[PDB]
Paper text:
Actin is one of the most abundant proteins in eukaryotic cells and plays essential roles in various cellular activities, including locomotion, division, and transcription control. The dynamic assembly of actin is controlled by the hydrolysis of ATP, bound to the center of the molecule. Upon polymerization, actin undergoes a conformational change from the monomeric G-form to the fibrous F-form, which is associated with the flipping of the side chain of His161 toward ATP. Here, we report the crystal structures of the three mutant actins bound to AMPPNP or ADP-Pi determined at a resolution of 1.35–1.55 Å, which are stabilized in the F-form conformation with the aid of the fragmin F1 domain.
The expressed wild-type human cardiac α-actin (cWT) bound to ADP was complexed with the fragmin domain 1 (F1/cWT complex) and crystallized in the presence of phosphate. In the crystal, cWT bound to ADP and Pi, both of which were present in the crystallization drop. The network of polar interactions in the active site of cWT in the ADP-Pi state (cWT_ADP-Pi) was identical to that of sWT in the ADP-Pi state (sWT_ADP-Pi). For example, Pi is surrounded by O2B and O3B (ADP), Oε1 (Gln137), N (Gly158 and Val159), Mg2+, and several water molecules. The distance between O3B (ADP) and O1G (Pi) is 2.6 Å, which is comparable to the distance observed in sWT_ADP-Pi (2.5 Å), confirming that a short hydrogen bond formed between the nucleotide and the cleaved Pi stabilized the ADP-Pi state. Furthermore, W2 of the coordinating water molecules was hydrogen-bonded to Nδ1 of His161. In contrast, His161 in cWT_ADP-Pi adopted the gauche-plus, flipped conformation (χ1 = 61° and χ2 = −91°), as observed in sWT_ADP-Pi (χ1 = 61° and χ2 = −91°). Furthermore, the electron density corresponding to the Cζ of methylated His73 in cWT was clearly observed, and its occupancy was unity as in sWT, demonstrating that His73 was completely methylated in both the expressed and the tissue-purified actins. Consequently, the observed structural similarities between cWT_ADP-Pi and sWT_ADP-Pi can safely confirm that the ATP hydrolysis mechanism proposed on the basis of crystal structures of skeletal muscle α-actin is applicable to cardiac muscle α-actin and, therefore, testable.
Author numbering:
A (entry chain B): 7 to 160
B (entry chain A): 5 to 41, 50 to 375
């Protein structure tokens, strides 16, 4: 078609990135995120991004969806920070939770200037990078999970 | 404050409330008027009284071509179906990509000046479907009643140079089925009869895995034939029309279009993306929309893309069972997020900037 005359004429622009960067400033969960080397974890709970306590990192409810930010020093500079962001989808998570985890992963990527590399991690399909995040015996799958945020239309 | 999500399809309105797991109102995007030349009827009621009405779709190939009738559709959606006051509800609308810019400009104007919504946003349909599937990377094939579009998305951003669009979708397939059913001596002509054939198509059509083999099977015996009871009680029989009709998606020359088929367009879209992300796109083809509901279409897409792609390429077609509603569901999810709503156009912003603001806020 003629992209410039169309409703996708502003996709891929600095303006798109600027608008989405501003939106990411309105999520309390990202404040202070990615400031030092380590792993930060949030769980989606009825559309909200809720921190997971450090004592629970590596334990995931099979019914839920999570965002895992891994901050590390890149090979190029031992004093700077780079990011892998993994979203983990339990085998029994509901559609609202997985979709929010996906959207909010992009938003955390935006918040960090596009630097994070994204990884979709379905239970039982976790990447080598994801398996490497947790100490020996650290990755545990828990039964159950929090209730969906969806209202069910009968 | 609860946002409304309205996916205005070429064929069907899907409307409801953000946070619900399905649209609460789904009805034909049609206005009916007396066939003999109340004044008019909308939606389900026009369909019910179509015996005396001529039916018109205000949306053709994803574009609003009758704004007075589209205003009737929106009014009916708010006041008669959902029974809400639109001035109380931020509203999410949807659009196929590569629409002319003026379409969403007038959508924005009407929502604020006529319906007085407090806030609104216009989303690209395939992006909503990708999020409904729990992905940030993949390539969506969305096919409704008006448009088939391919949108590759990487880390949450659609790749505009690789977006593909074909103005060939469900309504063209219905029209083609009407045409070829005349070979059997059936005559489906009128706008009311088009709705009957649309139902035949939805109930009995399928995509053959090997078209030429299936044509031979259809001539060798009656094993593929199905019967269908018309509203007047007459029973008809259809045979190879069952799969010749959706074969048009793979062979657009069946209706005289020189276009690539949906398998080729999907492949062409992937090939317009950077080579290092192509494996991820091939493994994440997501089907969306009612015209992707034909039995056998995923298997046929798998076979055809395999023939086009490098011989070792891992290819996966994802066909969510709920994909008639995937766009709406993705909208319900995103419209439940305060950060997404932060990007919506407020009434004050519209008052000060006018319709042009939609291009600066909605991506
Ligand atoms: N089971 C089915 N098989 C084939 N086509 C279908 C099926 N169900 C719906 N359709 C077609 O899909 C279209 C409506 O689907 P939808 O995604 O709501 O379209 P739109 O968004 O354009 O209104 C119509 O062309 C309809 O006939
Ligand atoms: Ca859950
Ligand atoms: Ca990134
Ligand atoms: Mg649609």
């Amino acid at each position: 078609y003629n992209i410039a005359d169309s409703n996708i004429a502003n996709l891929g622009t600095e303006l798109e990135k600027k608008v989405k960067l501003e939106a990411s400033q309105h999520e309390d969960a990202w404040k202070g995120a990615g400031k030092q080397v380590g792993v930060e974890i949030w769980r989606i709970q009825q559309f909200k991004v809720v921190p997971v306590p450090k004592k629970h990192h590596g334990s995931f409810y099979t019914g839920d969806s999570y965002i895992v930010l891994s901050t590390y020093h890149p090979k190029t500079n031992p004093d700077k920070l780079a990011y892998d962001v993994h979203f983990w989808l339990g085998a029994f998570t509901t559609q609202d939770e997985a979709g929010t985890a996906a959207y909010k992963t992009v938003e955390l990527d935006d918040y960090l200037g596009g630097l994070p590399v994204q990884y979709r991690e379905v239970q039982g399909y976790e990447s080598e990078r994801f398996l490497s995040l947790f100490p020996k015996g650290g990755l545990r799958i828990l039964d159950g999970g929090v209730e969906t945020g969806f209202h069910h239309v009968e | 404050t609860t946002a409304l999500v309205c996916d205005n399809g070429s064929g069907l309105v899907k409307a409801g409330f953000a946070g619900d797991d399905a649209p609460r109102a789904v009805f034909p995007s049609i206005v009916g008027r007396p066939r003999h030349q109340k004044d008019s009827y909308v939606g389900d009621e026009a369909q019910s009284k179509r015996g005396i009405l001529t039916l018109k779709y205000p949306i053709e190939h994803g574009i609003i071509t009758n704004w007075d009738d589209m205003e009737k559709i929106w009014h009916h959606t708010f006041y008669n179906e959902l029974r809400v006051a639109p001035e109380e509800h931020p509203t999410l609308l949807t659009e196929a990509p590569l629409n002319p810019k003026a379409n969403r400009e007038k959508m924005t104007q009407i929502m604020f000046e006529t319906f007085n919504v407090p806030a609104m946003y216009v989303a690209i349909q395939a992006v909503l479907s990708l999020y409904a599937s729990g992905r940030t990377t993949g390539i969506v094939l969305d096919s409704g009643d008006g448009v088939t579009h391919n949108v590759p998305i990487y880390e949450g951003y659609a790749l505009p140079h690789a977006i593909m669009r074909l103005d060939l979708a469900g309504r063209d397939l219905t029209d083609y089925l009407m045409k070829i059913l005349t070979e059997r001596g059936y005559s489906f002509v009128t706008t009311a009869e088009r709705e009957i054939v649309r139902d035949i198509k939805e109930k009995l059509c399928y995509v053959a895995l090997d078209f030429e083999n299936e044509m031979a099977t259809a001539a060798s015996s009656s094993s593929l034939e199905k019967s269908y009871e018309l509203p007047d009680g007459q029973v008809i029989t259809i045979g190879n029309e069952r799969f010749r009709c959706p074969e048009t998606l793979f062979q657009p020359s069946f209706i005289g279009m020189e276009s690539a088929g949906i398998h080729e367009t999907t492949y062409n879209s992937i090939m317009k993306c950077d080579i290092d992300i192509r494996k991820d796109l091939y493994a994440n083809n997501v089907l969306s929309g009612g015209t992707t509901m034909y039995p056998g279409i995923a298997d046929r897409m798998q076979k055809e893309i395999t023939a086009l792609a490098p011989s070792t390429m891992k290819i996966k077609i994802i066909a969510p069972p709920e994909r008639k509603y995937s766009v709406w569901i993705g909208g319900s999810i995103l419209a439940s997020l305060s950060t997404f709503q932060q990007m919506w156009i407020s009434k004050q912003e519209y008052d000060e900037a006018g319709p042009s603001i939609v291009h600066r806020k909605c991506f």
